[PDB]
């Protein structure tokens, strides 16, 4: 119950699951420049507002 299941579940298995999910989210892009440059526009709009107005 403890060594083979729950201590496994909490520290190592949770880390593996979270990193696998995040890697799948980050790396699964369709390779279309349209989406990338749309995200670039979004990022530019944010930097000029959430950062460029704060100084």
């Amino acid at each position: 119950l403890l060594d083979l299941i729950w201590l496994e579940t909490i520290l190592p298995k949770t880390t593996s699951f979270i990193q696998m999910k995040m890697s799948i989210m980050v790396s699964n892009q369709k390779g279309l420049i349209k989406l990338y440059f749309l995200s670039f526009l979004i990022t530019i709009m944010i930097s000029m507002t959430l950062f460029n107005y704060h100084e």
Partner: protein, 347 residues
Amino acid sequence: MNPIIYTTLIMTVMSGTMLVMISSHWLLIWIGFEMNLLAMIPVLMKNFNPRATEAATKYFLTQATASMMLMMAIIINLLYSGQWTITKMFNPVAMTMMTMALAMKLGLSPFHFWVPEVTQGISLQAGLLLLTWQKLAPLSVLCQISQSINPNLMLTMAMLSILIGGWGGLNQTQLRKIMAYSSIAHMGWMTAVLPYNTTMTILNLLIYITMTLAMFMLLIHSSATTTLSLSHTWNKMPVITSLMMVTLLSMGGLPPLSGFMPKWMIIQEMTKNESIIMPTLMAMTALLNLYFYMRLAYSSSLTMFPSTNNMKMKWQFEHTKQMKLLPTMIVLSTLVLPMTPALSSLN
């Protein structure tokens, strides 16, 4: 390509980078960037194929957008002060444009999307050039304007670069995409310390360039671009695989190897500025890069994968072309930790 033409194009790329290096005028720095891109585009397309064409097109679009933003920032800075010298920008908006432009040129997150695709779409020599030489000029420009950068935006981009590099590298079987995500993470590490000490950025640049050169040369020597193709190298060149494994451990930042020293120095320098949380997150995240380096080492050198029958014919042939600097790069990538105090010569 005619060898003379290739030599001229490589020299033009290098001369554009040096023009960015030696210029005191913003227009000359912009000219250097333009010349570098113009000479760089054909080099990506030396071996013609649709993938190389697509990579060159994406690279050109990204770099042209970055250059437009660069020029617009220069013009704003001129508008609010009749200055052309690269000392310290006088407008926060112009400086934000400059930062976004240089981050897009470097490939920092969230402008990272082009790096893995362009790296995958080109040959290993073009990948080596793109991931080593193309970083010098924007990093030099950022070093010159370090006192003007907004720490919040720069550090946010650096942390995002490290996280996204680790997560993206976790999912790759192609070696070029692995190297591209590793490059993104290393760029994030370098830009994290830039607002505090440019010497640390220069040291990290030198060590990362040495390790990347050694790794790309080892990948050219064992002509593989996928994990399974590299899995065959043990049955033909075990020494190459052992050196690859040691270099991969060095790239992961494990002591007492060389890759550990830049992270160590960056962490201690950041702690000098009462920055504790972010270096901790940075190391805990570079653990992911170490994980996929270890996966590559497992598949390449520490275990023996099945091979094919035709490898016997390859056993009878040596390498016709030899790389002169590969031995030196491996030694510098691994055994230079005891020479740490030499970094004072960089400032």
